[PDB]
Amino acid sequence: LKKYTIDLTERAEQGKLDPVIGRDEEIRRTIQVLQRRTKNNPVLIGEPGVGKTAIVEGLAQRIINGEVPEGLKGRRVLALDMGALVAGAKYRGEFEERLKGVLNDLAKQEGNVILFIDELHTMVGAGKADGAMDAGNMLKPALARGELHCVGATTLDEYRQYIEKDAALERRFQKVFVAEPSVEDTIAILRGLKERYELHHHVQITDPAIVAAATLSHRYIADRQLPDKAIDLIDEAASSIRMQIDSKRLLRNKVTDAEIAEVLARWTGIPVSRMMESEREKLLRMEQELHHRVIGQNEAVDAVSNAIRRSRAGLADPNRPIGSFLFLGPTGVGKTELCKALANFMFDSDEAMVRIDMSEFMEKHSVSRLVGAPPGYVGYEEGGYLTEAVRRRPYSVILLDEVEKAHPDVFNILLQVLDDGRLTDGQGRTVDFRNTVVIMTSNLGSDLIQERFGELDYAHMKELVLGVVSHNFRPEFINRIDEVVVFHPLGEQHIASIAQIQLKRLYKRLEERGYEIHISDEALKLLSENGYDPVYGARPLKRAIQQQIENPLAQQILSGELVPGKVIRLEVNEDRIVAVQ
Amino acid sequence: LKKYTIDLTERAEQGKLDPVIGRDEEIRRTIQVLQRRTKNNPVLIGEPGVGKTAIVEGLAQRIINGEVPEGLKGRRVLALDMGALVAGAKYRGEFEERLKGVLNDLAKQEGNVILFIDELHTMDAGNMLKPALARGELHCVGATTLDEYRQYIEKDAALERRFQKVFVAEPSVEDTIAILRGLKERYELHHHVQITDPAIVAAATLSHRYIADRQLPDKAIDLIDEAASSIRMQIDSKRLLRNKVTDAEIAEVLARWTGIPVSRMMESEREKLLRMEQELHHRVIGQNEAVDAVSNAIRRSRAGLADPNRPIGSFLFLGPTGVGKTELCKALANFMFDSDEAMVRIDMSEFMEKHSVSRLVGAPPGYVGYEEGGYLTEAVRRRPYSVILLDEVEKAHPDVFNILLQVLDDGRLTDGQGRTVDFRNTVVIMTSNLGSDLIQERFGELDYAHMKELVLGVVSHNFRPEFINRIDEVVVFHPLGEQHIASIAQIQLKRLYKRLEERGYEIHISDEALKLLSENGYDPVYGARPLKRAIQQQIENPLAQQILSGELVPGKVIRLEVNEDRIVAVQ
Ligand SMILES: Nc1ncnc2c1ncn2[C@@H]1O[C@H](COP(=O)(O)OP(=O)(O)OP(O)(O)=S)[C@@H](O)[C@H]1O
Ligand SMILES: Nc1ncnc2c1ncn2[C@@H]1O[C@H](COP(=O)(O)OP(=O)(O)O)[C@@H](O)[C@H]1O
Ligand SMILES: Nc1ncnc2c1ncn2[C@@H]1O[C@H](COP(=O)(O)OP(=O)(O)O)[C@@H](O)[C@H]1O
Ligand SMILES: Nc1ncnc2c1ncn2[C@@H]1O[C@H](COP(=O)(O)OP(=O)(O)O)[C@@H](O)[C@H]1O
């Protein structure tokens, strides 16, 4: 008994237990089960990192401090470990002499000992070496007779496929559900626990670093549960500052939310850290920073930058994505380019744009590729194309390209992402679109968008295109769109400004090779004859570097006069261009 | 007073320190993890180098020298005792009284001194130290591998509340450089051992080029100590010695299981006259169309100039299929890898299913079979060495055409689950099976610079102008004549010679006798596939008819005759 079971009650007299704050409805319900006549076995069902191990450490602190009823007064909470019972059990019945050694020491205790079996699912099938099970089949009489007082603490899905499968052991435990506390319920958890970390780290932790250790944990960390990550963050931040005082008021020890969001940015990647950066320079110039790489399209950025300012002010709907856009209009105008800009603004990486081409979803059978296959079908455990991608990046700009080429029954899949920000996978797991920006480019009115842009100034392309030919006949999808955005086609004013960032990002490395080129002003309209298109758009400009500028170097090698090291020009003549050394 | 007392004042008295060089942003991480109280147990995971030696020697350097005052220093911790645990203890249970006595009586001063434990994976990894770890006794520094971590330390649940994966990334060549910078404190003052600059790097460059299945620094510290053991024992083997340290000391140590000397292990600036005439041009005198990729398109790749996100070493090479592609993708791998492992062939010829979505560059969800998928899905996860082919893409209906544009540009690097794919060391040979099928007849007046501009100018841009608008360099493989295959039909017969001299028959064949085969030999449709069965049906199946009949006795060389309507070589 003293070889295996850790005694939590004498670990509470030394003050070695964490102070437990709250939990008084789940501790009282635990004592209500622990005082039952038969089957006095609570199982603290929760999720990993909810506090179900620090409920019995708030029961064992309670027995010593005496807030328990008489009947649980003066008990002992022993923490049996089923990993130390299957530890060296090689031979036949070395495990069964460990339980029947522990179970017979618990009967000498005449009911003065509470047994905390943490992770009961490790008891289901613990011996089980030759036949029927040996741990939750040896406890099974003394669990039903109300004899050993077994506080279990498993999680809900570990209860579901370990303990619920043994239906004769499932009834010997009573589910004391430990729901995770809310964001305000874990501040008081962490306000009293902060001094137990101040005495260990020799580090002062402010309640600003605690009110933001939980609002940033809950919002940004979605796989963990709340009083496990909020105390991870303060322990990581107090260890990050504990370097700054050891090795090399301005050499601080205080944790503030500057250090808490810095650890969380180092965990997840979301840079909302401090507004003492150029973010004050960035929050009102949010519409013109997109204009750095989205040339023109003032109706486009004033729809997307005003919607992502609407949520950074905490004013947008938290049961809806950050933005739901329909980018109908011409091709090669700034549709796909703004979403790269919007990803390079919000999550500052244009690799965080989940592009989905809806020409792959032409027919109705190809809708379970986005959402996932049902149980029992091909591609079930794989997932969906949209749902699993949003589980990869929950903070991403979803591009749904040419949605008018989708099936009509894929807008039905796209009614719940727009309205509620949810999409359930084929495996019954719901993915959360509340942090994504769902932008949907289309070409459904583009014939009438292009002809009327220099006629109807800035608002009449929105009205009166809807109803004769365009989307109103299927009306449930239009009103779920946040802003329907029409795109004015590009004149010569924009493609001269759009054809300047072709090699601007590669510009900052390749100087010493022998290349630095300033703007030449004579070959401007050579690219503005194939690239500046009223019909097909500005996308043939990207081929107008692959067809116009890059050809007579990489194949004209063998003739023996043109060798690299000299910067090329282009002039308006019938030249078949030369290059002088 | 023997077992559980280790004094760390001795480490400067004896010089028992092997200094760590290179790891500081991956060791101060294991001081961030260790300084916590939730999950304050760093387990060091990966390739070697740290192993509880970086935090203990990088601890006395900041206290005894004296830049910081004494009001801040005092973080004096200790290290592992592991040696006398199992040894010297006899009974069952009286071995256990030594392990319970080593943890409980270090608590004589109420936590005045703290202690780390090192290398905890064996089970002492959670059978006798598990209450000693759950009681909040003291915190330890683990060290596992990655796969032995997921054997023991993570499919548990009570142990990752204290441990966490600390991964170290694969180290430099400068790991053993500074191992021999400090260690001349022990080498030259008493033995006068020099090891020069090209002799430290020589036993360490063996990873990215030579062999890539094994870690670097385990193969670096051992192959220097064996090369440095040269003097005192080769003088006791019953102008005198090169005291100028060269590549020779490691080569005796390294090449005692390969057989390849120094001559191609340090391919350098002047060595590229020597790496032209080694193995490519002794099996076959020829195959010099593909030598351009190692001559003019090699200057901006192997001098620290390989930019992966635009094709610079991608020299385009065309031809037919089954005609010399698969041998050169092996013979260039034979010119590089000293062996045969390049097995790549991609064709889009005779399969009509909906499985052509996964052969592109991977499968997005909604499919079957991700484990194989396409061939290139698996050809980087196997090993990063493969030479990618592209054949017969020109036939299917035009909805499938333009997906070849996405990979060759700088848009997105296109991996599949988060680890990298190959962009730097691959030559792509593709296959053009347009109207170069009637041209295989004669070898008289074949075009090298009349072929691709006037024949291709009027036939390409009627149906599809988006295919040869990018790709322009067209030069043909060998035309299938007589004597150029008479070399190739000698290669497949000389492996029939070695198949036959094992039983005592040396067969000759004439220039007249193997062009007897050429009427039943090659195919313009399949390439040189029906060459091998033509050896079986014409000579080899009649040969085994005569070896078994006993009328071809071993020892006597036989000649042929021209005879009646079935052509066999009889007496
Ligand atoms: N109500 C609470 N009051 C004080 N500390 C708490 C409270 N809830 C949780 N904690 C602490 O936060 C952490 C939560 O971990 P646990 O209590 O083990 O929860 P858990 O459900 O057992 O997680 P696992 O995955 O089962 S180990 C521990 O360090 C607890 O001390
Ligand atoms: N409004 C715009 N702002 C900035 N760049 C633009 C704009 N419109 C077009 N471009 C340029 O045109 C190119 C269009 O390429 P592509 O993505 O193939 O077209 P599309 O976006 O229609 O698919 C982009 O690389 C981009 O640089
Ligand atoms: N970065 C480095 N700095 C110093 N020594 C190193 C470094 N990398 C490797 N070594 C040497 O390599 C050897 C690795 O052996 P070891 O630490 O026993 O392997 P493992 O860590 O797998 O147990 C050590 O003796 C060490 O001296
Ligand atoms: N240098 C060469 N010239 C002509 N034919 C060759 C050469 N090297 C190999 N071959 C032939 O290629 C054949 C294999 O080709 P094949 O099976 O059609 O293509 P793959 O091997 O790519 O499937 C071998 O039988 C061999 O005779």
Author numbering:
A (entry chain A): 161 to 408, 525 to 857
B (entry chain F): 161 to 283, 294 to 408, 525 to 857
Task: Quote the study that presented this structure, word for word.
They are members of the conserved family of AAA+ molecular machines that form dynamic hexameric-ring structures and undergo ATP hydrolysis-driven translocation of polypeptide substrates through a central channel.
Similar to previous substrate-bound structures, the protomers at the seam interface are identified to be flexible and at a lower overall resolution following refinement of the total dataset (after 2D classification). Following 3D classification two distinct structures (Pre and Post states) are identified and refined to 3.4, and 3.7 Å, respectively. Focus classification was performed to further improve the map of the P6–P1 interface. Conversely, the NBD1 and NBD2 of the seam protomers are in different nucleotide states and undergo changes between Pre and Post states that indicate hydrolysis is occurring. Notably, the P1-NBD1 is bound to ATPγS and in an active state in the Pre-state conformation, but bound to ADP and inactive in the Post state. This coincides with loss of substrate contact by the P1-NBD1 pore loop between the Pre and Post states. Conversely, the P1-NBD2 appears to be bound to ADP and inactive in both the Pre and Post states. Additionally, the P6 NBDs, which do not contact substrate, are both identified to be inactive in the Pre and Post states. Two conformations of the seam protomers are identified in different nucleotide states, revealing the translocation-step mechanism.
